[PDB]
Design a protein around this ligand. Sequence first.
Ligand SMILES: [Mg+2]
Ligand SMILES: [Mg+2]
Lengths: 280, 280
Amino acid sequence: VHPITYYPVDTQRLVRSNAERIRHKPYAHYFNPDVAVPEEVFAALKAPLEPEQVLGTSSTELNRLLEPGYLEGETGYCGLPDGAGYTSSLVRFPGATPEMFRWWFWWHSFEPERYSLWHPWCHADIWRTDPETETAPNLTDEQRYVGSTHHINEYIGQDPLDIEITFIDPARWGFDADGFAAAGIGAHACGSVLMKGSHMRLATMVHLARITDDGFELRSRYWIADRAEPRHDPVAGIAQLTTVPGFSGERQAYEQLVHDQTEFNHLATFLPDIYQEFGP
Amino acid sequence: VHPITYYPVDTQRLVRSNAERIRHKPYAHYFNPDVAVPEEVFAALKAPLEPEQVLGTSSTELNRLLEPGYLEGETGYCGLPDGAGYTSSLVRFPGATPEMFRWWFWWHSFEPERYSLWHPWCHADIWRTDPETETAPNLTDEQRYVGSTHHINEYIGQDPLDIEITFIDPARWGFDADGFAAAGIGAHACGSVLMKGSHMRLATMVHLARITDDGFELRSRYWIADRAEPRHDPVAGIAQLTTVPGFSGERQAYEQLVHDQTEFNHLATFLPDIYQEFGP
Ligand SMILES: [Mg+2]
Ligand SMILES: [Mg+2]
């Protein structure tokens, strides 16, 4: 692995802010500002994917994620014709289990300081409208974030964004959800990422946790600034993000690649431990 | 040393088109896109200098650069109060001599491909209007670039920049030229960096090569979006770069730091070899 060499200046402030506000929290000894990315993905950081390495959003294409082995371009980014963009990102979670992933995705979302463990440089804020769900009885791990919305403030590039991420049952997009078990997929986190104000789509997002001998691998896909949720129409009266005068789908896709690899490789360093300490 | 983990999308295009066009030059074998920064400056990539670590442009301040040992914050960046920026950077050149540096600063400037050697991802073009100066007999190395103007197209961040660098004798800014020999300074590359059209000031630029026992060390200073050339009056009719909407002096200073460290650490990997091969 190799240490990150670029830290946008607003994020140099935020990481210090986060380090301080978390001082007394019990999980605070998980706060490590050190971030890195594995040697194996460096080619993906230096050149875009070719068009034929891009996965589509039809159920045919999506369900290709359930095949054993790997697809073309497991990790990379590129611009798309619309002015939209695409990111794929594989991240390994050795010595962790998909249940830890499931656990993690609701656990982090109720305290901002918890969120800042995940990316100490970029995560500023997170809240839900349903605090109750943290403690309610007889819910599985999935039931505590699937269906929910996370209102998030974070940096995915130079500037802070206010985004709303709603998680969905993958079957809603035509995923062969029943086939998840046999394909060794044991956790998922899929949904739409909208801008807080205009509700423009920043990303259709997929996270699939597939079991490996050492733990599990995360296979993630983002279709950036696309026109619609898969298997749905565009929302009437909401413009595509590609219409925003300065916006670049290609560059956003690159930032998403860098962000995703930084975020999830970091999580993978302390997920099995924070689970053992704060989970069931 | 650590490899660069961040490559703006336009530079990923430029490095490929740079590799293509150099293919068949006699110095093509020096083209290597692997870039890296030393462990010792990571601190400086993660947080800004405080203002008491910023050197001024008064001849009294500039001349501190001649003092034995180091100043505070030899390597770093920060915003300045008036929207301006500041970059300082130290880069080590083991097995190199200041004379190779004097040689390099003219030799590279006469073909765009030579320039691309220096930073394969960011250098797109260079031209000078005095091609005879390359082959005029009996000129010192310094006479081949001091007073000359290099018209440059390059990335210092996300977007190409068309700039013009005009190199000056350091005396012209109040530098105790007499003192250079005894301070171990055997080469210099100082000048004003102006924007192609507007002639707005992008940087006041100082590069000093001080002899070390392993070769030389390069000590660099940039005052970004400053108001005038040292020891001179602001040109009437030119706005300060800080007046352009969107310009962050602070952000530009950070880009300049990443850019200096990449560039000159890269130059250091091959300068002794290409001097031996293409110099005197
Ligand atoms: Mg995120
Ligand atoms: Mg340069």
